[PDB]
Amino acid sequence: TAPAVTQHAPYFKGTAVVNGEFKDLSLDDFKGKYLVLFFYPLDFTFVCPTEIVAFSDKANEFHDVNCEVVAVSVDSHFCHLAWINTPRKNGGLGHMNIALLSDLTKQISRDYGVLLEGSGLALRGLFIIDPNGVIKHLSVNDLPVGRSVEETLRLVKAFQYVETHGEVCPANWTPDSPTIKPSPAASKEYFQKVN
Amino acid sequence: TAPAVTQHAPYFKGTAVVNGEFKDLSLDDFKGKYLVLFFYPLDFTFVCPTEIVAFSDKANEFHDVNCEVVAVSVDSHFCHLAWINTPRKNGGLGHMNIALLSDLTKQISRDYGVLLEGSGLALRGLFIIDPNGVIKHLSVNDLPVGRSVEETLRLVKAFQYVETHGEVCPANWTPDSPTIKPSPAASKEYFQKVN
Amino acid sequence: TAPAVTQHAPYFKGTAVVNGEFKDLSLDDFKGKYLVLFFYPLDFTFVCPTEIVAFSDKANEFHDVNCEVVAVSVDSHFCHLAWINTPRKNGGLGHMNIALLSDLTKQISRDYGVLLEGSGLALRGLFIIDPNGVIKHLSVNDLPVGRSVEETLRLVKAFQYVETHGEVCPANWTPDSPTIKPSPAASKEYFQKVN
Amino acid sequence: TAPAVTQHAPYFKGTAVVNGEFKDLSLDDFKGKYLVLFFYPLDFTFVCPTEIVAFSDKANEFHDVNCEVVAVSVDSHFCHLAWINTPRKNGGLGHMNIALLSDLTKQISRDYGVLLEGSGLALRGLFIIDPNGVIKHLSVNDLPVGRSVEETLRLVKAFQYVETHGEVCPANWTPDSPTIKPSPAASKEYFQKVN
Amino acid sequence: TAPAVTQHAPYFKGTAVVNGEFKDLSLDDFKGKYLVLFFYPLDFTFVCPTEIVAFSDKANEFHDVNCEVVAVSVDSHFCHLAWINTPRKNGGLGHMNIALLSDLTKQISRDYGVLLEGSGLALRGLFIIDPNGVIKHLSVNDLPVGRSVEETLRLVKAFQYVETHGEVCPANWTPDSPTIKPSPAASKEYFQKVN
Amino acid sequence: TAPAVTQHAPYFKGTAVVNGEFKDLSLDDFKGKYLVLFFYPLDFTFVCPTEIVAFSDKANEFHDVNCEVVAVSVDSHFCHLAWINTPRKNGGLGHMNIALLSDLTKQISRDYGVLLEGSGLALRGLFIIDPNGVIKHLSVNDLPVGRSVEETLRLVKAFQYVETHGEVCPANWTPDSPTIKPSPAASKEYFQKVN
């Protein structure tokens, strides 16, 4: 158990807002599914709502590939719900298709290595956890720059593609673009094709 | 000094292949410039050349925004050069517009927290280091999935945009798309505009 | 320094919402003044807003006796502002005449002995601190029961009365009700009068 | 066991004056009852008799709600009886409807955290203890200001209300005034009602 | 176990290139056979290829005396294969009749006492190991001077000769040159003959 | 100081037979010269005299290239002289052109890592030491197989060549055979030449 690629994701538990109501979520609940776990500093700020709404709008595409999306901050679940009941025009979230997890103890942020102890808030950390609870990817941005939802989706599909086809995914790979058979002889097919 | 966002990048030194010749590079050499430092497992493999060539083709766009790009693996600089003298058709790199750094001791990979000790090779780690040597972003992929060069460029520009405009960059932000003045009152302009 | 009657109030510093804007507040800022420092569990809850709006509505009467009122919880300053911008009939605060302090790190609550570590939120603790930073009174309620603003004010006036008259205040003392000269012979004035 | 809200009240045992007779009392004796355990500094002083007579006069209202009242000081039970046999006109108590506990060893005051060790007497600490021996409320005043009997009774009834109705009590709550259902949608009934 | 003459060769395991394909090799695999295990600094260098191609060209003569030849360096198995697929006139190896072992972790070199820790590469160490895994001979050259394949073979035949004839081999012994019966009286045959 | 390639040769001092006379020799005496320091097990044995006479016969060729040759065993200098005064026909040495060093304390063999402690004699270890007292080459044979005088001379001349020409010596290099300029472009001259 550690927040690094190839290791099992640290166990977490807390109260989330799912479908407008308070519900307990843990890492166990995502066994059998891909999980995108992402951390943002604070509710009612600036970059954070733009990421949350972009993930929620794209949520259907994650669910279609067996992937859940969970936003995490150090705020309370009550604050999370108030932010859902704020319209997007006024800096709010509106209706949500993803869970909003409250890390009120700050221990989830601590355990995933994203808590700024001095401030008491998480950096923009993101983790793609597989159905066996193993981390396949992680990314961290400093506070003023939002992440790419499109890139996160691309990555979830790439990992699923390698798992079910046994070919590897080139740089910039998108679905239906060429992949590589990972042995010296069979790889030649790919390299010849794109050059 | 630590490989985490907001901290100073660990010092590194080694021999690189720059413009077909062997040249020593260190973190000091990038003071005053943005640095994209990325790690790949091994020369003469499958995903790795596709990332290296994609970065090299896009290199001019990084240089135009004062950003250097350095690929790092545990292989020797002689191996790096042989891989440059292999054509892309045959799984090689061809002509390179970026440095290829040799981490022959494995200590650079160790110090940036990406070495798999048991195998003796680095995971697909990437670091965006600013002109003061501070890490603004990091990302790690497991071995079978290549990274996005476009996303790396987007991130380098976003960080530069916030540094020179004092507005923050929404999720999915591209140049000329709307940004946010990060105070409650002035932020309203952005939220009204896009909703 | 400790959170006990007769002892000096522990030092605190944090970001507050004062008149709709973010401002740094510390215990030093209340030197020369009386201070009602009260803790509440969470923004956007139930008992909490009623305590905050009752203190705000009564704040002019504390101010006229040189007493500031500061509400404290573990929520962010941004969350406090959002709750201020929520109308009272939707469970918000409306316009505030008191400061709302943000104990985002939880260290203020810890230092004042009111933090439930397991939950990451404060009990309903209240402290009356005199102009020299000494605690004259303290009270704690469990979470489902709100405090009396009326009683808080009475106690502030009573401590002020004894400091400028040298007589002590009986049980249920209100302004202009009889007081006691605190020596044996002189106390009989009081006891003969009320019996 | 600690003198903190949510915790089990420390065990105590000592000799009390009850109906003018000496009688042993322990914390066990109040199992199944609410208990207002209040400490005062010294017999034959000034604020103390006013608090003790106000509690004795209103004791019927506490007994009618299954609540005992026990006054505690470091004086002897013989001193308590002397005080009971002193008329109110002369700064005495007269006939009592409450128990006067002797904490002659000072251990009860010490265990409840209200003993001033250097002076050998207790601050004006009050504890409300439920039928399971858990502390629901504590308050402490510095010596020159008496407590409110009214507010103590308000708080006992408030804690009884939430236990038998499942609704939380707002600031300044009095019996028959409105309460709040402690979930987000259902709480709107309260906030709409009072605004 | 240690890398010293008369001692048992340290255990090694790694991935090698055997006949253009990747295969796991350990010291166990050479039980029953003689083994020339030689280390070289780096693929795609200068002395190194000449040693490897000379041993490969002479490999049939070692094989006819039940002796395998394994070349070892710290380069990856993929790098070895690339060097095999490079023609001899461009500084490559061409077709190989010997195994090329990859000591990617560097632990084989460390265990055989030939690793320069500071540089992360092996000195030119060579070991002749008998069918029971015992070291019969060892040699080390500094980096700019290649070894003699001719001398390696002579030493293998000499050790084999003594094992099946019970006579010892003089300085500069070649097959069919005179040998010595190793007791005082019987040795005079040899000494009378050559003088 | 260690008996390892690249390191300074351990200091030694002892009594030697030189021109049939006893004479002290130390490592300091060979400063400014190349030194072939070779150990053999025992005087009046079998392989040993063949090695010592072959080195003495070829000693002029070592002296012509500024290289001394010093044979070392654990025997006494009196025993060495006895052996010198024994004809070759009878397994002796005869007239010598090299020094015979006595390592009577066994410390020289012990410091050079070639002493078999349980037997009290040295393995067939050879060290080539340069004018600065650095070890360029070491070899060790088990007892029953003599070394090659030819190969030792080849190696001394090879190390001299690279020091005065700056080119590296291929496998099987003999004087006047081709060498390699040790940089990538310039090395092509060699590989094209021999293929």
Side-chain angles (χ1 to χ4, degrees), chain A residues 5-6, chain B residues 37-43 45 47-48 51 71-75 101 103 105-127 139-145 147, chain E residues 76 104:
Chain A
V5 175
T6 73
Chain B
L37 189 67
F38 81 98
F39 293 82
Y40 63 96
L42 285 177
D43 288 1
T45 58
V47 168
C48 311
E51 295 178 307
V72 197
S73 80
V74 298
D75 296 287
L101 182 60
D103 181 24
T105 60
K106 311 192 192 298
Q107 192 56 43
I108 309 177
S109 297
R110 209 169 266 117
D111 293 346
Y112 282 77
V114 293
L115 192 70
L116 294 179
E117 285 291 348
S119 325
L121 50 72
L123 291 163
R124 290 178 204 288
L126 180 149
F127 299 85
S139 38
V140 194
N141 283 8
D142 207 351
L143 309 187
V145 175
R147 293 154 270 194
Chain E
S76 84
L104 190 52

Short mmCIF file of all heavy atoms in Angstrom, two decimals, chain A residues 5-6, chain B residues 37-43 45 47-48 51 71-75 101 103 105-127 139-145 147, chain E residues 76 104:
data_model
loop_
_atom_site.label_atom_id
_atom_site.label_comp_id
_atom_site.label_asym_id
_atom_site.label_seq_id
_atom_site.Cartn_x
_atom_site.Cartn_y
_atom_site.Cartn_z
N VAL A 5 2.98 4.39 -8.76
CA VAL A 5 2.57 3.54 -9.87
C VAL A 5 3.13 2.12 -9.71
O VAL A 5 4.29 1.97 -9.34
CB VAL A 5 3.01 4.14 -11.22
CG1 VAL A 5 2.70 3.21 -12.39
CG2 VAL A 5 2.35 5.51 -11.42
N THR A 6 2.28 1.12 -9.96
CA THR A 6 2.50 -0.34 -9.72
C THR A 6 2.13 -0.86 -8.33
O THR A 6 2.08 -2.08 -8.14
CB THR A 6 3.92 -0.87 -10.05
OG1 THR A 6 4.86 -0.43 -9.05
CG2 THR A 6 4.36 -0.45 -11.45
N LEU B 37 11.65 17.25 -17.88
CA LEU B 37 12.51 16.10 -17.64
C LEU B 37 11.63 14.86 -17.65
O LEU B 37 10.76 14.71 -16.79
CB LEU B 37 13.22 16.26 -16.29
CG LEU B 37 14.32 15.24 -15.96
CD1 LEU B 37 15.51 15.44 -16.88
CD2 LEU B 37 14.76 15.34 -14.50
N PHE B 38 11.81 13.99 -18.64
CA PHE B 38 11.04 12.75 -18.67
C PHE B 38 11.89 11.48 -18.79
O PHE B 38 12.89 11.44 -19.50
CB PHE B 38 9.93 12.79 -19.71
CG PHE B 38 10.36 12.50 -21.11
CD1 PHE B 38 10.20 11.23 -21.65
CD2 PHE B 38 10.87 13.51 -21.92
CE1 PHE B 38 10.58 10.96 -22.96
CE2 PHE B 38 11.24 13.25 -23.23
CZ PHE B 38 11.10 11.97 -23.75
N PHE B 39 11.44 10.47 -18.07
CA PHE B 39 12.10 9.21 -17.89
C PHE B 39 11.35 8.17 -18.70
O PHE B 39 10.11 8.19 -18.74
CB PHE B 39 12.08 8.83 -16.38
CG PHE B 39 12.92 9.74 -15.52
CD1 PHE B 39 12.42 10.96 -15.08
CD2 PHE B 39 14.23 9.38 -15.16
CE1 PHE B 39 13.21 11.82 -14.31
CE2 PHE B 39 15.02 10.24 -14.39
CZ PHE B 39 14.51 11.46 -13.95
N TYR B 40 12.10 7.28 -19.36
CA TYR B 40 11.57 6.11 -20.04
C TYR B 40 12.41 4.87 -19.67
O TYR B 40 13.58 5.00 -19.31
CB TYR B 40 11.54 6.34 -21.54
CG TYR B 40 12.90 6.54 -22.16
CD1 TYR B 40 13.57 5.48 -22.76
CD2 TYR B 40 13.52 7.80 -22.17
CE1 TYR B 40 14.81 5.65 -23.32
CE2 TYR B 40 14.78 7.98 -22.75
CZ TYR B 40 15.42 6.90 -23.33
OH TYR B 40 16.67 7.04 -23.89
N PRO B 41 11.81 3.67 -19.75
CA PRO B 41 12.54 2.51 -19.23
C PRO B 41 13.84 2.18 -19.97
O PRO B 41 14.91 2.22 -19.34
CB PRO B 41 11.51 1.35 -19.34
CG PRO B 41 10.37 1.87 -20.14
CD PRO B 41 10.39 3.36 -20.00
N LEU B 42 13.76 1.91 -21.27
CA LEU B 42 14.88 1.33 -22.01
C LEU B 42 14.94 1.75 -23.48
O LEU B 42 13.91 1.86 -24.14
CB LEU B 42 14.82 -0.20 -21.94
CG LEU B 42 15.24 -0.86 -20.61
CD1 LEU B 42 15.04 -2.36 -20.68
CD2 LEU B 42 16.68 -0.54 -20.26
N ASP B 43 16.16 1.97 -23.97
CA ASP B 43 16.39 2.17 -25.39
C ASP B 43 16.07 0.88 -26.13
O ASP B 43 16.13 -0.20 -25.55
CB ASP B 43 17.85 2.56 -25.70
CG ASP B 43 18.23 3.97 -25.25
OD1 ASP B 43 17.38 4.69 -24.67
OD2 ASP B 43 19.39 4.38 -25.48
N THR B 45 13.24 -0.26 -27.25
CA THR B 45 11.94 -0.89 -26.93
C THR B 45 10.83 -0.27 -27.80
O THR B 45 11.12 0.13 -28.94
CB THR B 45 11.63 -0.83 -25.42
OG1 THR B 45 11.62 0.53 -24.96
CG2 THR B 45 12.64 -1.62 -24.64
N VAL B 47 7.14 1.55 -26.77
CA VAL B 47 6.48 2.82 -26.48
C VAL B 47 7.50 3.97 -26.47
O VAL B 47 7.22 5.05 -26.98
CB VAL B 47 5.72 2.76 -25.14
CG1 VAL B 47 5.26 4.15 -24.68
CG2 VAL B 47 4.51 1.85 -25.27
N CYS B 48 8.67 3.71 -25.87
CA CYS B 48 9.68 4.72 -25.62
C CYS B 48 10.11 5.53 -26.87
O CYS B 48 10.13 6.76 -26.80
CB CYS B 48 10.91 4.11 -24.92
SG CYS B 48 10.54 3.06 -23.47
N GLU B 51 7.53 8.17 -27.96
CA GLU B 51 7.47 9.36 -27.11
C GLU B 51 8.60 10.29 -27.44
O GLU B 51 8.41 11.50 -27.51
CB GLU B 51 7.55 8.98 -25.64
CG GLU B 51 6.38 8.16 -25.16
CD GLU B 51 6.50 7.75 -23.70
OE1 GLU B 51 7.55 7.16 -23.33
OE2 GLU B 51 5.55 8.03 -22.95
N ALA B 71 15.03 13.73 -22.31
CA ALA B 71 14.70 12.32 -22.10
C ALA B 71 15.80 11.64 -21.27
O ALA B 71 16.97 11.90 -21.51
CB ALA B 71 14.55 11.61 -23.44
N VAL B 72 15.42 10.80 -20.32
CA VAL B 72 16.36 10.14 -19.41
C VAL B 72 16.09 8.64 -19.35
O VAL B 72 14.96 8.23 -19.11
CB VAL B 72 16.23 10.66 -17.96
CG1 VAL B 72 17.45 10.28 -17.13
CG2 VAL B 72 16.02 12.16 -17.93
N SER B 73 17.12 7.81 -19.54
CA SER B 73 17.01 6.40 -19.16
C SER B 73 18.30 5.91 -18.54
O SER B 73 19.30 6.58 -18.59
CB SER B 73 16.61 5.50 -20.33
OG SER B 73 17.72 5.19 -21.17
N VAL B 74 18.21 4.72 -17.97
CA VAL B 74 19.35 4.03 -17.38
C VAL B 74 20.41 3.53 -18.38
O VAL B 74 21.45 3.03 -17.97
CB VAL B 74 18.91 2.83 -16.50
CG1 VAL B 74 18.06 3.30 -15.33
CG2 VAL B 74 18.23 1.75 -17.34
N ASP B 75 20.15 3.64 -19.68
CA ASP B 75 21.12 3.24 -20.68
C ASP B 75 22.30 4.21 -20.77
O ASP B 75 22.22 5.36 -20.33
CB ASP B 75 20.44 3.10 -22.05
CG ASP B 75 19.39 1.98 -22.09
OD1 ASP B 75 19.74 0.77 -22.09
OD2 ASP B 75 18.19 2.33 -22.12
N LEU B 101 19.68 12.03 -22.07
CA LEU B 101 20.54 11.93 -20.90
C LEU B 101 20.71 10.45 -20.47
O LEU B 101 19.74 9.73 -20.36
CB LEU B 101 19.92 12.74 -19.75
CG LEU B 101 20.66 12.84 -18.41
CD1 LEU B 101 22.04 13.46 -18.57
CD2 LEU B 101 19.84 13.65 -17.42
N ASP B 103 21.52 7.96 -17.53
CA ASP B 103 21.51 7.74 -16.08
C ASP B 103 22.14 6.36 -15.77
O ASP B 103 21.51 5.47 -15.19
CB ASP B 103 20.06 7.83 -15.58
CG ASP B 103 19.94 7.65 -14.09
OD1 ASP B 103 20.94 7.90 -13.37
OD2 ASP B 103 18.83 7.25 -13.64
N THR B 105 24.39 5.29 -13.66
CA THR B 105 24.46 4.92 -12.23
C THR B 105 23.10 4.55 -11.65
O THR B 105 23.02 3.99 -10.57
CB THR B 105 25.05 6.07 -11.38
OG1 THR B 105 24.23 7.25 -11.50
CG2 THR B 105 26.49 6.40 -11.82
N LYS B 106 22.03 4.89 -12.39
CA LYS B 106 20.63 4.82 -11.95
C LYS B 106 20.26 5.82 -10.84
O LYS B 106 19.14 5.76 -10.34
CB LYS B 106 20.24 3.40 -11.52
CG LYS B 106 20.62 2.31 -12.50
CD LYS B 106 19.93 0.99 -12.12
CE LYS B 106 20.50 -0.18 -12.88
NZ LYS B 106 20.31 -0.08 -14.35
N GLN B 107 21.17 6.73 -10.47
CA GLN B 107 20.98 7.60 -9.30
C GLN B 107 19.98 8.73 -9.58
O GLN B 107 19.25 9.14 -8.69
CB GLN B 107 22.32 8.17 -8.79
CG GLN B 107 22.27 8.85 -7.41
CD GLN B 107 21.71 7.94 -6.30
OE1 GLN B 107 22.05 6.75 -6.22
NE2 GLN B 107 20.82 8.50 -5.46
N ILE B 108 19.95 9.21 -10.83
CA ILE B 108 18.98 10.23 -11.23
C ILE B 108 17.56 9.66 -11.08
O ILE B 108 16.70 10.30 -10.48
CB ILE B 108 19.22 10.77 -12.67
CG1 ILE B 108 20.68 11.22 -12.87
CG2 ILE B 108 18.30 11.96 -12.94
CD1 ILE B 108 21.02 11.69 -14.26
N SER B 109 17.34 8.44 -11.58
CA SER B 109 16.04 7.76 -11.50
C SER B 109 15.63 7.51 -10.04
O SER B 109 14.47 7.72 -9.65
CB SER B 109 16.09 6.43 -12.27
OG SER B 109 16.33 6.65 -13.67
N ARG B 110 16.60 7.07 -9.25
CA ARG B 110 16.47 6.92 -7.80
C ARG B 110 16.06 8.23 -7.14
O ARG B 110 15.06 8.27 -6.44
CB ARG B 110 17.79 6.40 -7.20
CG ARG B 110 17.66 5.57 -5.93
CD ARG B 110 18.98 4.87 -5.56
NE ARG B 110 19.07 3.50 -6.10
CZ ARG B 110 19.96 3.04 -6.99
NH1 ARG B 110 20.91 3.81 -7.51
NH2 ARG B 110 19.88 1.76 -7.36
N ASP B 111 16.80 9.31 -7.42
CA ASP B 111 16.54 10.62 -6.81
C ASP B 111 15.20 11.27 -7.22
O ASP B 111 14.61 12.01 -6.43
CB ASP B 111 17.72 11.59 -7.05
CG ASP B 111 19.00 11.17 -6.31
OD1 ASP B 111 18.91 10.31 -5.42
OD2 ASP B 111 20.10 11.67 -6.62
N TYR B 112 14.71 10.97 -8.43
CA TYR B 112 13.37 11.42 -8.85
C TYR B 112 12.24 10.41 -8.55
O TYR B 112 11.09 10.60 -8.97
CB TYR B 112 13.38 11.84 -10.32
CG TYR B 112 13.97 13.21 -10.55
CD1 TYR B 112 15.33 13.41 -10.54
CD2 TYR B 112 13.15 14.31 -10.79
CE1 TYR B 112 15.87 14.66 -10.75
CE2 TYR B 112 13.68 15.56 -11.00
CZ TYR B 112 15.04 15.73 -10.97
OH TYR B 112 15.57 16.95 -11.20
N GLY B 113 12.56 9.34 -7.82
CA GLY B 113 11.55 8.44 -7.29
C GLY B 113 10.86 7.58 -8.33
O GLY B 113 9.72 7.17 -8.14
N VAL B 114 11.56 7.31 -9.43
CA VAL B 114 10.99 6.54 -10.53
C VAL B 114 11.70 5.21 -10.81
O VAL B 114 11.24 4.45 -11.64
CB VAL B 114 10.87 7.38 -11.84
CG1 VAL B 114 9.86 8.49 -11.65
CG2 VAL B 114 12.21 7.97 -12.25
N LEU B 115 12.79 4.90 -10.12
CA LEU B 115 13.50 3.65 -10.37
C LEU B 115 12.75 2.46 -9.77
O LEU B 115 12.37 2.50 -8.61
CB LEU B 115 14.91 3.69 -9.78
CG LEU B 115 15.83 2.56 -10.24
CD1 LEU B 115 16.20 2.74 -11.70
CD2 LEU B 115 17.09 2.48 -9.38
N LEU B 116 12.55 1.42 -10.59
CA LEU B 116 12.10 0.12 -10.12
C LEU B 116 13.37 -0.62 -9.78
O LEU B 116 14.08 -1.06 -10.68
CB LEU B 116 11.33 -0.64 -11.20
CG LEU B 116 9.99 -0.04 -11.64
CD1 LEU B 116 9.35 -0.90 -12.73
CD2 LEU B 116 9.07 0.10 -10.44
N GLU B 117 13.68 -0.71 -8.48
CA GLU B 117 14.97 -1.23 -8.01
C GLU B 117 15.22 -2.65 -8.50
O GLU B 117 16.33 -2.96 -8.93
CB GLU B 117 15.07 -1.20 -6.48
CG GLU B 117 15.31 0.18 -5.89
CD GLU B 117 16.70 0.75 -6.20
OE1 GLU B 117 17.60 0.01 -6.67
OE2 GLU B 117 16.90 1.96 -5.95
N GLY B 118 14.17 -3.47 -8.43
CA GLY B 118 14.25 -4.87 -8.80
C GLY B 118 14.61 -5.15 -10.25
O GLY B 118 15.33 -6.11 -10.53
N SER B 119 14.10 -4.30 -11.15
CA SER B 119 14.34 -4.40 -12.60
C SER B 119 15.55 -3.57 -13.06
O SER B 119 16.18 -3.90 -14.08
CB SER B 119 13.12 -3.91 -13.36
OG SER B 119 11.93 -4.24 -12.68
N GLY B 120 15.84 -2.48 -12.34
CA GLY B 120 16.90 -1.55 -12.70
C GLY B 120 16.55 -0.62 -13.85
O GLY B 120 17.41 -0.30 -14.67
N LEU B 121 15.30 -0.17 -13.91
CA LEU B 121 14.84 0.76 -14.95
C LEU B 121 13.79 1.70 -14.39
O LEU B 121 13.20 1.43 -13.36
CB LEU B 121 14.34 0.01 -16.19
CG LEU B 121 13.32 -1.11 -16.02
CD1 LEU B 121 11.95 -0.57 -15.66
CD2 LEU B 121 13.22 -1.97 -17.29
N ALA B 122 13.58 2.82 -15.08
CA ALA B 122 12.67 3.86 -14.63
C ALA B 122 11.27 3.65 -15.23
O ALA B 122 11.13 3.21 -16.36
CB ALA B 122 13.20 5.24 -15.00
N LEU B 123 10.26 3.98 -14.44
CA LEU B 123 8.90 4.15 -14.94
C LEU B 123 8.78 5.39 -15.80
O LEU B 123 9.69 6.21 -15.83
CB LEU B 123 7.94 4.31 -13.76
CG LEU B 123 7.74 3.08 -12.90
CD1 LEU B 123 7.12 3.50 -11.57
CD2 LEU B 123 6.86 2.10 -13.64
N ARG B 124 7.64 5.55 -16.47
CA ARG B 124 7.39 6.70 -17.33
C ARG B 124 7.03 7.94 -16.54
O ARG B 124 5.86 8.37 -16.52
CB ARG B 124 6.32 6.41 -18.39
CG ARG B 124 6.80 5.43 -19.42
CD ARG B 124 5.77 5.05 -20.47
NE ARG B 124 6.14 3.75 -21.01
CZ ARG B 124 7.16 3.53 -21.84
NH1 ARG B 124 7.93 4.53 -22.30
NH2 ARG B 124 7.41 2.28 -22.21
N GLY B 125 8.04 8.51 -15.90
CA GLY B 125 7.86 9.70 -15.05
C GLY B 125 8.18 10.94 -15.85
O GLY B 125 9.05 10.94 -16.69
N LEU B 126 7.46 12.02 -15.56
CA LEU B 126 7.66 13.28 -16.27
C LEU B 126 7.52 14.40 -15.27
O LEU B 126 6.61 14.36 -14.45
CB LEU B 126 6.64 13.45 -17.40
CG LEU B 126 6.69 14.73 -18.25
CD1 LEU B 126 6.22 14.43 -19.66
CD2 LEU B 126 5.89 15.90 -17.66
N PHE B 127 8.40 15.40 -15.39
CA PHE B 127 8.47 16.54 -14.48
C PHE B 127 8.59 17.83 -15.26
O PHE B 127 9.40 17.94 -16.17
CB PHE B 127 9.70 16.40 -13.58
CG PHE B 127 9.68 15.17 -12.72
CD1 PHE B 127 10.15 13.96 -13.23
CD2 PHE B 127 9.19 15.22 -11.42
CE1 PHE B 127 10.10 12.81 -12.44
CE2 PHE B 127 9.17 14.08 -10.63
CZ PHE B 127 9.62 12.87 -11.14
N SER B 139 3.98 13.61 -13.57
CA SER B 139 3.11 12.52 -13.99
C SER B 139 3.89 11.24 -14.15
O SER B 139 5.05 11.27 -14.56
CB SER B 139 2.37 12.86 -15.30
OG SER B 139 3.17 13.59 -16.22
N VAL B 140 3.25 10.11 -13.82
CA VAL B 140 3.85 8.80 -13.97
C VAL B 140 2.86 7.83 -14.62
O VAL B 140 1.74 7.67 -14.14
CB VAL B 140 4.33 8.23 -12.62
CG1 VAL B 140 5.26 7.04 -12.83
CG2 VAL B 140 5.06 9.28 -11.80
N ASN B 141 3.29 7.18 -15.71
CA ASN B 141 2.54 6.07 -16.33
C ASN B 141 3.27 4.76 -16.10
O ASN B 141 4.49 4.72 -16.04
CB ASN B 141 2.43 6.24 -17.86
CG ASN B 141 1.38 7.26 -18.29
OD1 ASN B 141 0.80 7.99 -17.47
ND2 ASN B 141 1.15 7.33 -19.60
N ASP B 142 2.50 3.68 -16.02
CA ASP B 142 3.07 2.34 -16.05
C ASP B 142 3.60 2.11 -17.46
O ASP B 142 3.17 2.77 -18.41
CB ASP B 142 2.02 1.27 -15.67
CG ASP B 142 2.65 0.00 -15.06
OD1 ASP B 142 3.89 -0.16 -15.08
OD2 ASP B 142 1.87 -0.83 -14.55
N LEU B 143 4.51 1.16 -17.59
CA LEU B 143 5.27 0.92 -18.83
C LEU B 143 4.50 0.77 -20.16
O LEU B 143 4.96 1.26 -21.16
CB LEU B 143 6.21 -0.28 -18.65
CG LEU B 143 7.12 -0.30 -17.42
CD1 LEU B 143 8.07 -1.48 -17.52
CD2 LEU B 143 7.89 1.01 -17.25
N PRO B 144 3.33 0.11 -20.19
CA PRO B 144 2.70 -0.09 -21.52
C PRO B 144 1.93 1.09 -22.17
O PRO B 144 1.40 0.90 -23.26
CB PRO B 144 1.73 -1.26 -21.26
CG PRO B 144 1.43 -1.19 -19.81
CD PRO B 144 2.67 -0.70 -19.14
N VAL B 145 1.86 2.27 -21.53
CA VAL B 145 1.08 3.38 -22.07
C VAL B 145 1.93 4.64 -22.18
O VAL B 145 2.39 5.19 -21.18
CB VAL B 145 -0.17 3.67 -21.20
CG1 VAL B 145 -0.92 4.91 -21.69
CG2 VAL B 145 -1.08 2.46 -21.19
N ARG B 147 2.76 8.63 -23.04
CA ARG B 147 2.25 9.93 -22.58
C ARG B 147 1.82 10.82 -23.75
O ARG B 147 2.03 10.49 -24.91
CB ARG B 147 3.34 10.65 -21.80
CG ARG B 147 3.69 9.96 -20.50
CD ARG B 147 5.12 10.28 -20.08
NE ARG B 147 6.11 9.33 -20.60
CZ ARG B 147 7.36 9.25 -20.16
NH1 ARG B 147 7.78 10.05 -19.19
NH2 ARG B 147 8.20 8.35 -20.67
N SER E 76 21.02 -3.46 -21.20
CA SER E 76 19.77 -4.23 -21.30
C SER E 76 19.88 -5.31 -22.38
O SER E 76 20.74 -5.22 -23.27
CB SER E 76 18.56 -3.32 -21.59
OG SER E 76 18.39 -3.03 -22.98
N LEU E 104 21.40 -5.91 -16.00
CA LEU E 104 20.74 -4.61 -15.90
C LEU E 104 20.74 -4.04 -14.48
O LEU E 104 20.87 -2.84 -14.32
CB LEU E 104 19.32 -4.69 -16.43
CG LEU E 104 18.54 -3.39 -16.62
CD1 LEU E 104 19.31 -2.36 -17.44
CD2 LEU E 104 17.19 -3.69 -17.26
#
